Amino acid sequence: PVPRSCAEPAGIPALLSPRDKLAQLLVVGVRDAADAQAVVTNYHVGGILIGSDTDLTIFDGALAEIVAGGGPLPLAVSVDEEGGRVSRLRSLIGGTGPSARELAQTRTVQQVRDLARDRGRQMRKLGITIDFAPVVDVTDAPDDTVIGDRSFGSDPATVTAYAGAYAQGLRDAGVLPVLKHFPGHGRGSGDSHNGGVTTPPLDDLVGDDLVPYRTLVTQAPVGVMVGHLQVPGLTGSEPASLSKAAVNLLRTGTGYGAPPFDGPVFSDDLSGMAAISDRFGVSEAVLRTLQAGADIALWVTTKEVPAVLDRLEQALRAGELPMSAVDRSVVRVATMKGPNPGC
Protein backbone atom coordinates (compact mmCIF):
# COMPACT_ATOMS: atom_id res chain seq x y z
CA PRO A 1 0.00 0.00 0.00
CA VAL A 2 2.44 2.69 -1.17
CA PRO A 3 0.59 5.95 -2.05
CA ARG A 4 1.45 8.07 -5.10
CA SER A 5 3.35 11.33 -4.57
CA CYS A 6 4.17 14.58 -6.35
CA ALA A 7 7.59 15.06 -4.66
CA GLU A 8 10.53 15.71 -7.00
CA PRO A 9 12.91 12.77 -7.70
CA ALA A 10 15.67 14.00 -5.38
CA GLY A 11 13.14 13.99 -2.55
CA ILE A 12 11.52 10.65 -3.25
CA PRO A 13 13.79 8.80 -0.76
CA ALA A 14 12.37 10.81 2.18
CA LEU A 15 8.99 9.20 1.46
CA LEU A 16 10.04 5.57 1.70
CA SER A 17 10.95 2.93 4.28
CA PRO A 18 14.32 1.24 3.76
CA ARG A 19 12.68 -1.97 2.51
CA ASP A 20 10.57 -0.10 -0.06
CA LYS A 21 13.62 1.89 -1.25
CA LEU A 22 15.43 -1.41 -1.90
CA ALA A 23 12.32 -2.79 -3.63
CA GLN A 24 12.38 0.13 -6.09
CA LEU A 25 15.68 -1.19 -7.43
CA LEU A 26 14.34 -4.60 -8.48
CA VAL A 27 12.85 -5.61 -11.85
CA VAL A 28 11.48 -9.15 -12.16
CA GLY A 29 10.12 -11.45 -14.86
CA VAL A 30 6.52 -12.64 -14.36
CA ARG A 31 4.50 -15.72 -15.34
CA ASP A 32 1.09 -14.13 -15.89
CA ALA A 33 -1.40 -11.57 -14.60
CA ALA A 34 -1.75 -13.20 -11.16
CA ASP A 35 2.01 -13.54 -10.60
CA ALA A 36 2.59 -9.91 -11.54
CA GLN A 37 -0.32 -8.61 -9.40
CA ALA A 38 0.90 -10.54 -6.36
CA VAL A 39 4.55 -9.46 -6.51
CA VAL A 40 3.56 -5.76 -6.87
CA THR A 41 0.92 -5.84 -4.11
CA ASN A 42 3.02 -7.78 -1.60
CA TYR A 43 6.58 -6.55 -2.19
CA HIS A 44 6.21 -3.26 -4.10
CA VAL A 45 8.87 -3.99 -6.73
CA GLY A 46 10.03 -1.14 -8.93
CA GLY A 47 9.19 -2.98 -12.12
CA ILE A 48 8.37 -6.15 -14.01
CA LEU A 49 9.78 -7.92 -17.05
CA ILE A 50 7.65 -9.28 -19.89
CA GLY A 51 9.96 -12.26 -20.32
CA SER A 52 10.10 -15.32 -22.59
CA ASP A 53 7.59 -17.30 -20.52
CA THR A 54 5.20 -14.42 -19.78
CA ASP A 55 1.53 -14.98 -20.71
CA LEU A 56 0.78 -12.10 -23.07
CA THR A 57 -2.93 -11.95 -22.08
CA ILE A 58 -1.59 -9.79 -19.25
CA PHE A 59 -2.01 -6.92 -21.75
CA ASP A 60 -5.77 -7.50 -22.06
CA GLY A 61 -6.82 -5.39 -19.07
CA ALA A 62 -4.87 -6.86 -16.19
CA LEU A 63 -1.83 -4.62 -16.63
CA ALA A 64 -3.55 -1.23 -16.28
CA GLU A 65 -4.94 -2.14 -12.85
CA ILE A 66 -1.60 -3.53 -11.71
CA VAL A 67 0.13 -0.35 -12.77
CA ALA A 68 -2.65 1.80 -11.28
CA GLY A 69 -2.18 0.23 -7.85
CA GLY A 70 1.58 0.72 -7.48
CA GLY A 71 3.50 3.60 -5.91
CA PRO A 72 4.82 6.12 -5.30
CA LEU A 73 5.63 6.46 -8.99
CA PRO A 74 4.45 4.54 -12.04
CA LEU A 75 5.46 0.88 -12.24
CA ALA A 76 8.22 0.19 -14.80
CA VAL A 77 7.32 -2.35 -17.54
CA SER A 78 10.19 -3.81 -19.57
CA VAL A 79 10.68 -6.26 -22.48
CA ASP A 80 13.29 -7.64 -24.92
CA GLU A 81 12.29 -6.15 -28.26
CA GLU A 82 15.19 -5.95 -30.71
CA GLY A 83 13.46 -7.44 -33.73
CA GLY A 84 14.44 -10.51 -35.78
CA ARG A 85 15.49 -13.34 -33.48
CA VAL A 86 14.71 -11.44 -30.26
CA SER A 87 11.17 -10.11 -30.53
CA ARG A 88 8.92 -11.02 -27.59
CA LEU A 89 5.94 -9.00 -28.85
CA ARG A 90 6.05 -10.14 -32.48
CA SER A 91 2.47 -11.45 -32.20
CA LEU A 92 1.21 -8.00 -31.22
CA ILE A 93 3.23 -5.26 -32.91
CA GLY A 94 3.44 -6.50 -36.49
CA GLY A 95 5.87 -9.42 -36.42
CA THR A 96 9.61 -9.89 -35.84
CA GLY A 97 10.62 -7.69 -38.72
CA PRO A 98 14.21 -7.98 -39.96
CA SER A 99 17.23 -8.52 -37.71
CA ALA A 100 19.50 -5.63 -36.76
CA ARG A 101 22.12 -6.87 -39.24
CA GLU A 102 19.53 -7.13 -42.00
CA LEU A 103 18.21 -3.59 -41.25
CA ALA A 104 21.61 -1.92 -41.57
CA GLN A 105 22.03 -3.66 -44.93
CA THR A 106 18.65 -3.07 -46.52
CA ARG A 107 17.27 0.24 -45.12
CA THR A 108 18.57 3.81 -44.57
CA VAL A 109 19.31 5.26 -41.15
CA GLN A 110 16.17 7.37 -41.30
CA GLN A 111 14.05 4.34 -42.32
CA VAL A 112 15.42 2.57 -39.28
CA ARG A 113 14.37 5.51 -37.12
CA ASP A 114 10.91 5.23 -38.77
CA LEU A 115 10.58 1.55 -37.90
CA ALA A 116 11.76 1.96 -34.31
CA ARG A 117 9.29 4.80 -33.74
CA ASP A 118 6.32 2.84 -35.10
CA ARG A 119 7.13 -0.32 -33.10
CA GLY A 120 7.78 1.89 -30.06
CA ARG A 121 4.41 3.58 -30.49
CA GLN A 122 2.62 0.20 -30.47
CA MET A 123 4.63 -0.88 -27.41
CA ARG A 124 3.67 2.27 -25.50
CA LYS A 125 -0.06 1.70 -26.16
CA LEU A 126 0.26 -1.79 -24.63
CA GLY A 127 1.86 -0.38 -21.48
CA ILE A 128 5.60 -0.89 -22.17
CA THR A 129 7.86 1.79 -20.63
CA ILE A 130 11.32 0.21 -21.21
CA ASP A 131 12.81 -1.74 -24.14
CA PHE A 132 16.15 -3.50 -23.71
CA ALA A 133 17.41 -2.30 -27.10
CA PRO A 134 19.39 -1.28 -29.14
CA VAL A 135 22.27 -3.69 -29.18
CA VAL A 136 25.45 -1.70 -29.75
CA ASP A 137 27.78 -4.75 -29.81
CA VAL A 138 30.25 -4.77 -32.75
CA THR A 139 30.86 -8.10 -34.56
CA ASP A 140 31.09 -9.99 -37.85
CA ALA A 141 30.28 -13.40 -36.32
CA PRO A 142 27.79 -15.75 -38.09
CA ASP A 143 24.05 -14.86 -38.05
CA ASP A 144 22.92 -17.55 -35.62
CA THR A 145 25.68 -17.01 -33.01
CA VAL A 146 24.91 -15.49 -29.58
CA ILE A 147 25.19 -11.95 -30.88
CA GLY A 148 25.40 -12.62 -34.62
CA ASP A 149 22.71 -10.80 -36.58
CA ARG A 150 21.62 -8.98 -33.40
CA SER A 151 24.46 -6.53 -34.20
CA PHE A 152 24.11 -3.59 -36.56
CA GLY A 153 27.62 -4.11 -38.00
CA SER A 154 31.32 -4.94 -37.69
CA ASP A 155 32.43 -1.30 -37.85
CA PRO A 156 31.92 1.15 -34.91
CA ALA A 157 30.83 4.12 -37.07
CA THR A 158 28.16 1.96 -38.72
CA VAL A 159 26.89 0.80 -35.35
CA THR A 160 26.84 4.38 -34.00
CA ALA A 161 24.75 5.54 -36.95
CA TYR A 162 22.19 2.69 -36.94
CA ALA A 163 21.88 1.88 -33.22
CA GLY A 164 21.68 5.65 -32.67
CA ALA A 165 18.75 5.88 -35.09
CA TYR A 166 16.97 2.97 -33.34
CA ALA A 167 17.31 4.51 -29.89
CA GLN A 168 16.01 7.87 -31.18
CA GLY A 169 13.00 6.11 -32.72
CA LEU A 170 12.03 4.53 -29.40
CA ARG A 171 12.70 7.90 -27.69
CA ASP A 172 10.37 9.56 -30.27
CA ALA A 173 7.58 7.28 -29.04
CA GLY A 174 8.19 7.85 -25.32
CA VAL A 175 9.88 4.47 -24.62
CA LEU A 176 13.25 4.26 -22.78
CA PRO A 177 15.98 2.78 -24.99
CA VAL A 178 18.70 0.71 -23.29
CA LEU A 179 22.13 0.21 -24.89
CA LYS A 180 23.71 -3.25 -24.42
CA HIS A 181 25.95 -5.00 -23.47
CA PHE A 182 28.58 -2.69 -21.86
CA PRO A 183 31.52 -2.69 -22.41
CA GLY A 184 31.15 -4.88 -25.48
CA HIS A 185 29.92 -8.44 -26.12
CA GLY A 186 30.64 -8.58 -29.85
CA ARG A 187 34.00 -10.34 -29.65
CA GLY A 188 33.34 -12.25 -26.41
CA SER A 189 34.84 -15.71 -25.90
CA GLY A 190 31.42 -17.40 -25.80
CA ASP A 191 27.77 -17.24 -24.69
CA SER A 192 26.97 -15.53 -21.38
CA HIS A 193 23.83 -17.63 -21.03
CA ASN A 194 25.58 -20.95 -20.39
CA GLY A 195 29.06 -19.94 -19.23
CA GLY A 196 31.76 -17.41 -18.34
CA VAL A 197 32.72 -14.99 -21.08
CA THR A 198 35.86 -12.86 -21.54
CA THR A 199 36.39 -9.77 -23.77
CA PRO A 200 39.51 -8.56 -25.66
CA PRO A 201 41.83 -6.40 -23.52
CA LEU A 202 40.61 -3.00 -22.29
CA ASP A 203 42.92 -1.12 -24.70
CA ASP A 204 41.37 -2.91 -27.64
CA LEU A 205 37.85 -2.09 -26.40
CA VAL A 206 38.58 1.62 -25.97
CA GLY A 207 39.46 1.97 -29.65
CA ASP A 208 36.68 -0.24 -31.01
CA ASP A 209 33.81 -1.75 -28.99
CA LEU A 210 33.41 1.30 -26.71
CA VAL A 211 33.43 3.96 -29.46
CA PRO A 212 29.61 3.93 -30.07
CA TYR A 213 29.01 4.70 -26.39
CA ARG A 214 31.05 7.97 -26.51
CA THR A 215 28.22 9.69 -28.36
CA LEU A 216 25.13 7.58 -27.56
CA VAL A 217 25.26 7.93 -23.76
CA THR A 218 24.69 11.69 -24.10
CA GLN A 219 21.34 11.47 -25.86
CA ALA A 220 18.86 11.41 -22.96
CA PRO A 221 16.81 9.69 -21.88
CA VAL A 222 18.86 6.48 -22.31
CA GLY A 223 19.81 3.56 -20.06
CA VAL A 224 22.83 1.21 -20.20
CA MET A 225 22.82 -2.57 -19.55
CA VAL A 226 26.13 -4.03 -18.33
CA GLY A 227 26.93 -7.57 -19.50
CA HIS A 228 28.31 -10.54 -17.58
CA LEU A 229 31.70 -9.93 -19.15
CA GLN A 230 35.22 -10.50 -17.79
CA VAL A 231 37.50 -7.74 -19.08
CA PRO A 232 41.33 -8.01 -19.00
CA GLY A 233 42.77 -4.82 -17.50
CA LEU A 234 39.48 -3.79 -15.85
CA THR A 235 37.57 -6.50 -13.93
CA GLY A 236 39.86 -9.53 -13.62
CA SER A 237 37.80 -12.70 -13.28
CA GLU A 238 34.64 -10.84 -12.18
CA PRO A 239 31.80 -10.18 -14.64
CA ALA A 240 31.38 -6.46 -15.45
CA SER A 241 27.79 -6.40 -14.08
CA LEU A 242 29.20 -7.27 -10.66
CA SER A 243 32.30 -5.07 -10.95
CA LYS A 244 32.49 -1.56 -9.47
CA ALA A 245 35.55 -0.85 -11.63
CA ALA A 246 33.49 -1.44 -14.80
CA VAL A 247 30.49 0.64 -13.66
CA ASN A 248 32.87 3.42 -12.46
CA LEU A 249 34.39 3.61 -15.99
CA LEU A 250 30.89 4.14 -17.37
CA ARG A 251 30.15 6.78 -14.71
CA THR A 252 33.37 8.80 -15.35
CA GLY A 253 33.72 8.33 -19.11
CA THR A 254 37.21 9.89 -19.31
CA GLY A 255 39.00 6.56 -19.62
CA TYR A 256 37.37 5.64 -22.94
CA GLY A 257 36.90 9.16 -24.35
CA ALA A 258 33.33 9.82 -23.18
CA PRO A 259 31.54 12.40 -21.03
CA PRO A 260 30.28 11.08 -17.66
CA PHE A 261 27.02 9.03 -17.48
CA ASP A 262 24.47 9.67 -14.72
CA GLY A 263 21.49 7.82 -16.25
CA PRO A 264 20.01 4.45 -15.14
CA VAL A 265 22.32 1.39 -15.21
CA PHE A 266 20.89 -2.16 -15.49
CA SER A 267 22.44 -5.56 -14.80
CA ASP A 268 21.88 -8.27 -17.38
CA ASP A 269 19.64 -11.18 -16.22
CA LEU A 270 21.03 -12.48 -12.90
CA SER A 271 19.04 -15.66 -12.49
CA GLY A 272 18.62 -17.30 -15.86
CA MET A 273 22.22 -16.92 -17.00
CA ALA A 274 24.90 -19.44 -16.10
CA ALA A 275 27.69 -16.85 -16.21
CA ILE A 276 26.24 -15.64 -12.92
CA SER A 277 24.29 -18.62 -11.59
CA ASP A 278 27.30 -20.96 -11.83
CA ARG A 279 28.99 -18.89 -9.13
CA PHE A 280 26.24 -16.95 -7.28
CA GLY A 281 22.75 -17.56 -5.90
CA VAL A 282 20.19 -14.86 -6.70
CA SER A 283 20.19 -12.80 -3.50
CA GLU A 284 24.02 -12.68 -3.48
CA ALA A 285 24.09 -11.63 -7.12
CA VAL A 286 21.63 -8.80 -6.48
CA LEU A 287 23.74 -7.54 -3.56
CA ARG A 288 26.89 -7.57 -5.72
CA THR A 289 25.40 -5.65 -8.64
CA LEU A 290 24.02 -2.92 -6.35
CA GLN A 291 27.41 -2.85 -4.61
CA ALA A 292 28.93 -2.21 -8.06
CA GLY A 293 26.74 0.83 -8.65
CA ALA A 294 23.97 -0.58 -10.87
CA ASP A 295 20.60 1.09 -10.23
CA ILE A 296 18.39 -1.82 -11.39
CA ALA A 297 18.92 -5.46 -10.52
CA LEU A 298 17.19 -7.59 -13.16
CA TRP A 299 16.15 -11.26 -13.24
CA VAL A 300 13.36 -13.39 -14.69
CA THR A 301 11.32 -14.91 -11.84
CA THR A 302 9.43 -13.59 -8.82
CA LYS A 303 9.92 -16.33 -6.23
CA GLU A 304 13.28 -15.04 -4.98
CA VAL A 305 12.00 -11.58 -4.00
CA PRO A 306 11.24 -12.11 -0.28
CA ALA A 307 14.68 -13.69 0.29
CA VAL A 308 16.48 -11.01 -1.75
CA LEU A 309 14.92 -8.16 0.24
CA ASP A 310 15.77 -9.88 3.49
CA ARG A 311 19.43 -10.21 2.44
CA LEU A 312 19.57 -6.59 1.26
CA GLU A 313 18.15 -5.35 4.56
CA GLN A 314 20.87 -7.40 6.29
CA ALA A 315 23.51 -5.71 4.14
CA LEU A 316 22.18 -2.32 5.21
CA ARG A 317 22.46 -3.10 8.92
CA ALA A 318 25.88 -4.76 8.64
CA GLY A 319 27.28 -1.92 6.54
CA GLU A 320 27.86 -4.06 3.44
CA LEU A 321 25.85 -1.48 1.52
CA PRO A 322 25.59 2.19 2.52
CA MET A 323 22.26 4.05 2.41
CA SER A 324 23.83 6.84 0.34
CA ALA A 325 24.27 4.27 -2.43
CA VAL A 326 20.63 3.10 -2.23
CA ASP A 327 19.31 6.68 -2.10
CA ARG A 328 21.35 7.73 -5.15
CA SER A 329 19.93 4.88 -7.22
CA VAL A 330 16.37 5.55 -6.01
CA VAL A 331 16.72 9.11 -7.33
CA ARG A 332 17.92 7.83 -10.69
CA VAL A 333 14.97 5.50 -11.03
CA ALA A 334 12.47 8.22 -10.07
CA THR A 335 13.98 10.42 -12.80
CA MET A 336 13.71 7.53 -15.25
CA LYS A 337 10.06 6.88 -14.36
CA GLY A 338 9.01 10.51 -14.58
CA PRO A 339 6.23 12.29 -12.74
CA ASN A 340 2.82 10.95 -11.80
CA PRO A 341 -0.11 12.00 -13.94
CA GLY A 342 -2.25 14.44 -11.99
CA CYS A 343 0.73 16.29 -10.60
Author numbering: 46 to 388
Q: Would you copy out the relevant sentences from the publication that reported this structure?
A:
Despite the absence of other known PG-recycling proteins, we have shown that LpqI is an authentic exo-acting β-N-acetylglucosaminidase, which is able to cleave PG fragments in vitro. In previously characterised PG-recycling systems free amino sugars are produced by NagZ, which belongs to the CAZy glycoside hydrolase family 3 (GH3). The β-N-acetylglucosaminidase sub-family including all known NagZ enzymes utilise a conserved Asp-His catalytic dyad, which has been well characterised.
To test this, we cloned, expressed and purified LpqITB using an N-terminal His6-SUMO tag, which was subsequently cleaved from the protein. LpqI consists of a single TIM-barrel domain similar to cytoplasmic Gram-negative orthologs but lacks the C-terminal domain associated with extracellular NagZ enzymes from some Gram-positive bacteria. In this assay, LpqI was not observed to release any soluble PG in contrast to the muramidase mutanolysin. Together these data support the role of LpqI as an exo-acting enzyme involved in fragment recycling, rather than as an endo-acting autolysin. From these experiments, we concluded that LpqI is involved in amino sugar recovery but is not required for stem-peptide recycling. In contrast to inhibition of P. aeruginosa NagZ, deletion of lpqI resulted in an increase in survival in the presence of lysozyme and all cell wall active antibiotics tested.
